[PDB]
Amino acid sequence: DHIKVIYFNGRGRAESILMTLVAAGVNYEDERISFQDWPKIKPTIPGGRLPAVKITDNHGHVKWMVESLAIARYMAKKHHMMGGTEEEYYNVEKLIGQAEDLEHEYYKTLMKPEEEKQKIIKEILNGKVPVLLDIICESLKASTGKLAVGDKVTLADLVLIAVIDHVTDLDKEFLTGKYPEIHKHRENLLASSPRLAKYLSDRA
Amino acid sequence: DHIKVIYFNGRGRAESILMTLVAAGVNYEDERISFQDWPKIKPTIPGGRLPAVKITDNHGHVKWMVESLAIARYMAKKHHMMGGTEEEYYNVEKLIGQAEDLEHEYYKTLMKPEEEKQKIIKEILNGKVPVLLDIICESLKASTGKLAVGDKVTLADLVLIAVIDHVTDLDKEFLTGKYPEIHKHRENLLASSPRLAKYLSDRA
Ligand SMILES: N[C@H](CCC(=O)N[C@@H](CS)C(=O)NCC(=O)O)C(=O)O
Numbered sequence: 001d002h003i004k005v006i007y008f009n010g011r012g013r014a015e016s017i018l019m020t021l022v023a024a025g026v027n028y029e030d031e032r033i034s035f036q037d038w039p040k041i042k043p044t045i046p047g048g049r050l051p052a053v054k055i056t057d058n059h060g061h062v063k064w065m066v067e068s069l070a071i072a073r074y075m076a077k078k079h080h081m082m083g084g085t086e087e088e089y090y091n092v093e094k095l096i097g098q099a100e101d102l103e104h105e106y107y108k109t110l111m112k113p114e115e116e117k118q119k120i121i122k123e124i125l126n127g128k129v130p131v132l133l134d135i136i137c138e139s140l141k142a143s144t145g146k147l148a149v150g151d152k153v154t155l156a157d158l159v160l161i162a163v164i165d166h167v168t169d170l171d172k173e174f175l176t177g178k179y180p181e182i183h184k185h186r187e188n189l190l191a192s193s194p195r196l197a198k199y200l201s202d203r204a
Numbered sequence: 205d206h207i208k209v210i211y212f213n214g215r216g217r218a219e220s221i222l223m224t225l226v227a228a229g230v231n232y233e234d235e236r237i238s239f240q241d242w243p244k245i246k247p248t249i250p251g252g253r254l255p256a257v258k259i260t261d262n263h264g265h266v267k268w269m270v271e272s273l274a275i276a277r278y279m280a281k282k283h284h285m286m287g288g289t290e291e292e293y294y295n296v297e298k299l300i301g302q303a304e305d306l307e308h309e310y311y312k313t314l315m316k317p318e319e320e321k322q323k324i325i326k327e328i329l330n331g332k333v334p335v336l337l338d339i340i341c342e343s344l345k346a347s348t349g350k351l352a353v354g355d356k357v358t359l360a361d362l363v364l365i366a367v368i369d370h371v372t373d374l375d376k377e378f379l380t381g382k383y384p385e386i387h388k389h390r391e392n393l394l395a396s397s398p399r400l401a402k403y404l405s406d407r408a
Pocket residue numbers: 008013042048049050051066067068069301302305
């Protein structure tokens with residue numbers, strides 16, 4: 001199957017999809033759409049929104065998928081990255097939900113004039129952000145292995161790395177000297193997934 | 205097992221958990237915590253946040269669960285409400301993600317003075333809300349059965365009903381004469397789940 005991932009230029013919602021395929025060792029085509037080209041392409045995308053995934057097989061079948069984390073969960077399940085038991089499934093989902101909570105705080109800062117952007121950053125960094133980082137640390141602490149859940153890569157590992165990258169976009173040193181569990185998780189994940197480490201280093 | 209669901213007084217994040225147990229016919233204890241009693245109870249809750257679920261078996265084991273939709277997904281999976289195939293799993297998750305997007309627009313209106321609350325309501329109702337309602341309508345259209353995904357209740361059905369209830373909290377008539385798929389889905393769901401219909405009618 002040819003898998004084409006269609007998104008805007010950056011690590012936004014598509015990152016969960018990209019990292020899942022990378023970690024699972026699945027080949028795919030990147031299609032980054034520029035702001036200027038979007039109006040033309042928008043009507044050709046079922047549902048008119050990105051990320052979208054177009055899967056084409058060698059017998060002419062075309063499957064369109066939308067909703068970034070639903071795509072990511074589907075692919076993760078296919079490649080045994082959603083937990084091997086019900087309990088591990090719950091713990092995978094628990095960390096995804098916590099990471100997504102944190103992501104929504106980050107979202108508050110987007111498409112705002114610099115002036116109120118810094119006010120929001122200060123608000124969230126003095127409010128919900130450290131609360132969620134600690135809660136995530138507790139989730140990581142409870143793992144029986146080196147990763148979010150056990151010793152094998154799950155979607156939870158991938159969503160966490162992406163959201164932490166957004167936190168450090170807001171304040172580069174926010175995690176410095178703090179949250180040892182999150183730092184250790186990043187080390188362990190990159191150690192366990194050379195494919196992901198290479199991907200993260202290569203990223204434009 | 206005794207299942208105790210702990211939340212604040214209302215339909216907020218706990219609703220997905222409550223509706224899942226109701227639809228699956230699982231008995232549980234409701235524990236609603238008042239604003240005034242929260243400070244005392246907060247330290248006794250692992251992670252210090254609600255919803256939380258405490259499950260106690262008849263051999264003294266105590267299991268604590270947090271993160272509302274991770275709990276809901278876990279319970280839904282246990283009771284065959286997350287899809288019967290990978291494709292149905294994806295479609296369940298697609299509608300959950302769409303419904304949660306809509307929920308986050310609703311969240312924008314919370315804990316705001318009446319003045320800017322109405323400005324935000326007008327903004328979202330003229331912006332992302334109708335966009336997401338239509339996208340949800342398309343998801344429903346693509347079902348092979350009467351419900352969100354097939355003919356049997358899934359977590360997607362339940363999350364959708366709860367989020368639509370929040371939209372109508374903001375504007376009672378927003379769906380009137382519009383979004384026929386959403387109206388039909390509500391009818392079909394209540395028809396298919398007398399347990400849920402009774403629960404929704406009884407709600408305080
Ligand atoms: N629930 C999201 C929704 C994606 C979304 O918000 N897409 C926006 C990203 S800019 C979009 O494509 N918007 C407007 C447009 O397509 O014109 C997902 O994770 O896929």
